[PDB]
Design a protein around this ligand. Structure first.
Ligand SMILES: *[C@H](O)[C@H](CC(C)C)NC(=O)[C@H](CC(C)C)NC(=O)[C@H](CC(C)C)NC(=O)OCc1ccccc1
Ligand SMILES: [Cl-]
Ligand code: NA
Ligand code: NA
Lengths: 305, 306
């Protein structure tokens, strides 16, 4: 028993992190097969970052302009190209620690583990969700660019995030490993802001189920609702609409606990309308929304990798 | 910016996790050099749970009664010994992935990462604190015994916890890697209960300094307090006493933010009195006490967002 915010074990990803240096800029790279992936803004001076012409700045650059360091071994760069906002550096040595892996683009509400790195060295691991506004509430300092987010399935690492920047509110924005930003952001120094976020309804419901499974039941009640009526409540409280697909995904937890999703929506409806009356759920005074239904089942099942 | 429950990268520990089986019982072991460490209660059977005599149970075992499995490879046990509540199995192969490591016994309030494992296979990583009542608030299912807690400050793994059992309130108890339990607990299934737990005051203060570092001051006030008046108030909310050691430990955070420790004590006293009036601190609506001063310095910028 117990319920904790849990990250995937990070060892398979630790063996892929390297340090990439171009000019005065050092950040982190992901070394898979014979290619190192990192943010393309590594080629930019501070002057360039105001209005960068990445095409022109890159063709200027050459292989020898890039220093890649794996531990204390220099990787010789033998090729360089761009894919969207990611720079790809071909090196002369395939990473012998390359795990089974895929590049995956995730949807808002989905969670993943972040391996925060500095100077190519893993520093910490934590769990976070892609927010509805396409930011992540990360924990990153200067030099963290190029840190990656991932999920594991058995032996396969699914890389879904590379870190590029911090927004003025302190939240974070990045790309998938193909260099496509999450959210309406660009890799230049210009006015940019997180849009108004919403709460991830299906994940709150998932966590309410986790609470019931762990013996927290005070919020349950005799009432049920409909999707239409609940979604009017959701809109009122800046919760994401609940769809039929969300209900289907929560099916397992509904069966296990005996609380139909619309039964639990009636609990959440009341929590949104009345508050928690001084009580906590799973040790929180807020409605937690960064556990997916899968996360709840995996932690309450003991899945290993 | 930002602030998260941040664990250490677990790879160095992943490469030490094995499966240990004795009889019908399977759990996790820690393979360092040519020794596998696991909970000694792997040698218990159904009848042995209330009043096991581990000396008598163990003398009946040969080396080949212990099956150790590292991934797909069966390791051969060539010796065994019991140290307190840990079994040490000598194997014929030194672990080639052994990291630099040490064994440390921690004090209540200290934090560490836990690599939850099942059948020798890692499941997930999270942060925990040793509570004042010598339990931890983990996430552990059947077969998690032998999972370990650790820190990795400066490329050396400091192992500080091995999981042995779950108490009735859902919290967890275990030992250091020398097999000595944290707290008054024993590896018997006789009735045992965690003592009333308390909040780790020095850690809450560390987390309030983190919030200031990250740019939020709304909770401060114009007051100060004596250490004794602070403790007289805080203990009425079931907070642990704050000692001069704790005050000294908070020095660096006080220096970086310009807020005297006892002035941050005054703020905490008022937070306990008032609540947050619908606000949060670093994304939480409760006062968080599982970040230590060292953890805050590890994770936060050295430059306050003034
Ligand atoms: C090992 O994987 C397992 C891990 C738990 C998280 C399940 N540990 C045990 O089974 C352990 C073995 C004994 C010999 C130390 N027993 C317990 O943890 C046990 C609870 C289990 C059966 C779920 N706890 C226990 O016995 O606590 C003492 C006690 C007894 C009676 C009443 C209250 C408390
Ligand atoms: Cl009804
Ligand atoms: Na209901
Ligand atoms: Na010790």
């Amino acid at each position: 028993s117990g319920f904790r915010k849990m990250a995937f074990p990070s060892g398979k990803v630790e063996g892929c992190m390297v340090q990439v240096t171009c000019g005065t800029t050092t950040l982190n790279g992901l070394w898979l097969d014979d290619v190192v992936y990192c943010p393309r803004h590594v080629i930019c001076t501070s002057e360039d970052m105001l209005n960068p012409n990445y095409e022109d700045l890159l063709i200027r650059k050459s292989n020898h302009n890039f220093l890649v360091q794996a531990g204390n071994v220099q990787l010789r760069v033998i090729g360089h190209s761009m894919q969207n906002c990611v720079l790809k550096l071909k090196v002369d040595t395939a990473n012998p620690k390359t795990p089974k892996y895929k590049f995956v683009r995730i949807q808002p509400g989905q969670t993943f583990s972040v391996l925060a790195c500095y100077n190519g060295s893993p520093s910490g691991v934590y769990q976070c969700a892609m927010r509805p506004n396409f930011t992540i509430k990360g924990s990153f300092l200067n030099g963290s660019c190029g840190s990656v987010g991932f999920n594991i399935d058995y032996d396969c690492v699914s890389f879904c995030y590379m870190h590029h920047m911090e927004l003025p509110t302190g939240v974070h924005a990045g790309t998938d490993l193909e260099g496509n930003f999450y959210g309406p952001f660009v890799d230049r120094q210009t006015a940019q802001a997180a849009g108004t976020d919403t709460t991830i309804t299906v994940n709150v419901l998932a966590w309410l189920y986790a609470a019931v499974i762990n013996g927290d039941r005070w919020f349950l009640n005799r009432f049920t609702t409909t999707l239409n009526d609940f979604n009017l409540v959701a809109m009122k409280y800046n919760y994401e609409p609940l769809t039929q697909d969300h209900v289907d995904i929560l099916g397992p937890l509904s069966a296990q606990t005996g609380i139909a999703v619309l039964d639990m929506c009636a609990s959440l409806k009341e929590l949104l309308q009345n508050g928690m009356n001084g009580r906590t759920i799973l040790g929180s005074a807020l409605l937690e929304d960064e556990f997916t239904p899968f996360d709840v089942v995996r932690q309450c099942s003991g899945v290993t990798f």
